[PDB]
Structures are given as structure tokens and as C-alpha cells.
């Protein structure tokens, strides 16, 4: 593990913070781990799991995805580029889910959380798939505070990867819901400088990013489909000690590359 870990330790020292990584080869079972059981703030990365929770609920409530959500101005919070434009008409549950995943739309995220029973409702969904580490405690935007020591609104790289594998490749979602989730992740355009930058262009990637805006705290998780080979699932999370420390997309891409090259 010393030869596995040392390049990650070098990377986080030059970054000036902490990096957590977990990667799983779903064919062979091989893994790469660094700080994989430590907690890191989720920031907007929870929005991918939120869409999965909505899709899972649609397996018990036919027509949930078509349900219209007609909201007022008070539902709008900062960084709501899609939901801001449909204030005059409303949006359906599926349209809000797409916006939360692919634009990180905050109002859409809060509206979907409300449908699920709040942050506690998303945490309960994660428990239902066997994830005991994930916890969402607050709403947008308070969940982005990323204060050192605080376990609220955190998970671990290993738990993120394990849950992502269950939802995108395992049995948690039925085939139509599973392909919708995978398509939302694959079409996400916000992570071109993160895990995607470490992956050969020929290989499809689906990802969800998060960027708290403070404490150098940012992240990305992804499924990678190498051609003609079993997919890889991985998660890369960062944080830093000072409130004004800057996050780095380059550090996330570099850590992703170190993990992908070390699988085997
Ligand atoms: C709300 C804000 O803190 C942040 C988050 O939820 O984590 C929003 C803003 C951003 S927009 C990303 C812009 N990409 C720049 N390269 C993200 C994200 O990283 O997905 N989500």
C-alpha cells in the first residue's frame, strides 16, 4: 500500500489539502484506495443520488416521474438556471431530476428533496441500498458549508463508489430507470476537467460533480466504460483547511488518473 499511496500523498501536499479516492474494477474486483473511509462534504454530488432516489420511488409509484410540480418564486435559490425559467409554467419530477443532475440546479434539488420528505428522506433511501455512511442533514444552500470537523452532509469515497455501482450497474434500479440514470450521468457537461479529463476519449463516462465554494472542497464520482471490458466505478473528493483555500479541478483529474492506472 506504500507504493499505491505515495503519489496520492504527494498530490495532496502540493494541493495543500486532503484527497480521498476509491476505485473499483467491477469485473475483477480489484480496487485502489486512499483515505477511502474518511468523510468528505458531498456538496452538489448528492444530486446524482437524489435523482436515483426519485427513479427508485417511481418503481413503487407509477407515474411519479410525470407528476407536475408548480412552484412559486420562494422555491428559487441561488444557482437555479433551469428552474428559474419555468417559474411561469412548472416542471415535472423527471424534468427537475434532469436539471439537478446535469445543471446542478439548486431549486430543483430542494423541490425533489421536499417530495422525498426532506434531507432525511434521501438519507433513508441511501440506507435502503445498504449505504450506512452517507448522510444528508441540510438543504441547499446550507449543506455546502463544508466546515472542518463537521460530519453533516458528508460521505466517504468508498461508500460513494459502492452506492454508485449498485445504482448504475447492480439491481437497485429496474432497466428503464437504470438507463435513464446512466444517460443523465453520461450527458452531464459540468465535469469535463475532472474525472473525464483522465479517461481516453474513446471510453464513455458518466459523472456528477460537486463544488462547495469554500475550504477547497470539491469532488467528482463516475462510471467509466472501457471498450469491451468491465466498467470501472470511482470517486474523488477533496477538502482543505482554510476557508479561502481554492479547489482544483486539475488535482481531481490527476488523482483520478492515478487511481485508474493502478487498477490492473
Ligand atoms: C451550488 C454550488 O455549491 C455547486 C454544488 O452544488 O456543488 C453547484 C455549482 C457548480 S457548477 C459547475 C461549473 N463547472 C466549472 N468547471 C456545481 C458542480 O460542480 O456540479 N454545483
Structural domain spans, the chain: 1-262
Please report which residue ranges of 83-172 form alpha helices under DSSP H. 93-102, 106-115, 119-128, 157-168
- Name the E strands within the chain: 18-25, 31-34, 40-41, 68-69, 91-92, 154-155, 204-211, 218-225, 232-239
CA of 210 to the centre of ligand 1 (A): 5
Give the method used.
X-ray
Please indicate whether residue 210, judged by its CB atom, sits closer than 6 Å to ligand 1.
yes
Check pocket membership of 145 for ligand 1, CB cut-off 6 A: no
Q: What are phi and psi of 192, to 5 degrees?
A: -65, -25
Q: Give the pairing type, strands 91-92 and 154-155.
A: unpaired
The domain 1-262 is placed in CATH, from the list 2.30.30.830, 3.40.710.10, 3.40.50.300, 3.40.1280.10, at 3.40.710.10
Query: Under 8 Å CB-to-CB from 11, ≥6 apart: which residues?
Result: 19, 251, 254, 255, 258
Q: Using CA atoms, how far apart are residues 91 and 107, in angstroms rounded to an integer?
A: 11
- Our answer on whether the CB atom of 248 is closer than 6 Å to any ligand 1 atom is no
- Between CA 232 and CA 165 the distance in angstroms is 9
- Residues for the chain: how many in total? 264
Q: Residue 245: exposed, middle, or buried by beta-carbon count in 10 A (0-12, 13-18, 19+)?
A: middle
Ligand 1 centroid, distance to 2 Cα (angstroms):
34
CB proximity list for 44: less than 8 A, separation 6 or greater? 104, 109, 144, 208, 209, 210, 211
Q: Residue 106: CB within 6 Å of ligand 1?
A: yes
Whether residue 82 contacts residue 99, with contact meaning beta carbons closer than 8 Å, is answered with yes
Q: Nearest to residue 101, comparing CAs of 162, 40, 55?
A: 55
Ligand 1 pocket, residue 44 CB under 6 Å: yes
What resolution in angstroms does the PDB record give? 1.8
Cα(78)–Cα(161) distance, rounded to whole angstroms? 29
- The answer, yes or no, to whether any atom of ligand 1 lies below 6 A from the CB of 104, is yes
Nine cell digits for residue 33: 484506495
| Any atom of ligand 1 within 6 Å of the Cβ of 177 | no
Q: Which residue has the cell 419530477?
A: 93
Nearest to 102 by CA among 246, 262, 209: 209
Compute the distance from residue 25 Cα to the ligand 1 centre, in Å: 27
Largest CA distance in the chain: 57
Q: Is 185:210 a contact under the CB 8 Å cutoff?
A: no
CA distance 196 to 262: 17
Assigned C-alpha cell, 40: 468528505
- Closest ligand 1 atom, residue 109 Cα: 6
- 157 in contact with ligand 1, CB cutoff 6 A: no
Nearest residue to 245 via CA among 14, 17, 10, 38: 17
For residues 21 and 216, give the distance between their C-alpha atoms in angstroms, rounded to a whole number.
Answer: 16
Counting ligand 1 atoms within 8 A of each CB, the residue from 104, 139, 192, 237 with the most, and so the one to mutate, is: 104
How far CA 147 is from CA of 17, 39, 143, 217, in Å, comes to 14, 12, 10, 10
| Residue of 211, 212, 222, 248 to test ligand 1 pocket, by largest number of atoms within 8 Å of CB | 211
DSSP secondary structure string, 138-195?
S-TTGGG---TT--TTEE-HHHHHHHHHHHHTSSSS-HHHHHHHHHHHHT--TTTTTG
**CA nearest 167: which of 189, 188, 184, 149?**
184
CA distance 226 to 237: 22
The 3-state DSSP class for residue 41 equals strand
| Local structure of residue 135 (DSSP, 8 states) | B
Distance between Cα 134 and ligand 1 center (Å): 20
Residue 210's DSSP bridge partners are 219
Atom 12 of ligand 1, residue of closest alpha carbon:
190
102 Cβ inside 6 Å of ligand 1: no
Buried residues in 176-207 as b, exposed as e (16+ CB within 10 A): ebbebbbebbeebebbeebbbbbbeeeeebbb
Amino acid at each position: 500500500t506504500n507504493l499505491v499511496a505515495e503519489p496520492f500523498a504527494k498530490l495532496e501536499q502540493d494541493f495543500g489539502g486532503s484527497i480521498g479516492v476509491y476505485a473499483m474494477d467491477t469485473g475483477s474486483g480489484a480496487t485502489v484506495s486512499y483515505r477511502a473511509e474518511e468523510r468528505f462534504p458531498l456538496c452538489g454530488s448528492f444530486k446524482g443520488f437524489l435523482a436515483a432516489a426519485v427513479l427508485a420511488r417511481s418503481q413503487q409509484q407509477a407515474g411519479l416521474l410525470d407528476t407536475p410540480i408548480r412552484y412559486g418564486k420562494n422555491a428559487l435559490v441561488p444557482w437555479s438556471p433551469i428552474s428559474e425559467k419555468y417559474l411561469t409554467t412548472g416542471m415535472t419530477v423527471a424534468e427537475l431530476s434532469a436539471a439537478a443532475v446535469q445543471y446542478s440546479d439548486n431549486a430543483a434539488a430542494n423541490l425533489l428533496l421536499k417530495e422525498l420528505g426532506g434531507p432525511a428522506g434521501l438519507t433513508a433511501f441511501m440506507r435502503s441500498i445498504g449505504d450506512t455512511t452517507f448522510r444528508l442533514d441540510r438543504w441547499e444552500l446550507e449543506l455546502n458549508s463544508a466546515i472542518p470537523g463537521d460530519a453533516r452532509d458528508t460521505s466517504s469515497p468508498r461508500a460513494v463508489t459502492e452506492s454508485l455501482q449498485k445504482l448504475t450497474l447492480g439491481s437497485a434500479l429496474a432497466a428503464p430507470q437504470r438507463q435513464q440514470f446512466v444517460d443523465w450521468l453520461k450527458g452531464n457537461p459540468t465535469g469535463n476537467h475532472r474525472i473525464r479529463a483522465a479517461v481516453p476519449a474513446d471510453w464513455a463516462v458518466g459523472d456528477k460533480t460537486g463544488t462547495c465554494g469554500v475550504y477547497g472542497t470539491a469532488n467528482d464520482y463516475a462510471v467509466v466504460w472501457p471498450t469491451g471490458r468491465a466498467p470501472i466505478v470511482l470517486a474523488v473528493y477533496t477538502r482543505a483547511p482554510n476557508k479561502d483555500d481554492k479547489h482544483s479541478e486539475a488535482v481531481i483529474a490527476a488523482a483520478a488518473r492515478l487511481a485508474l492506472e493502478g487498477l490492473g
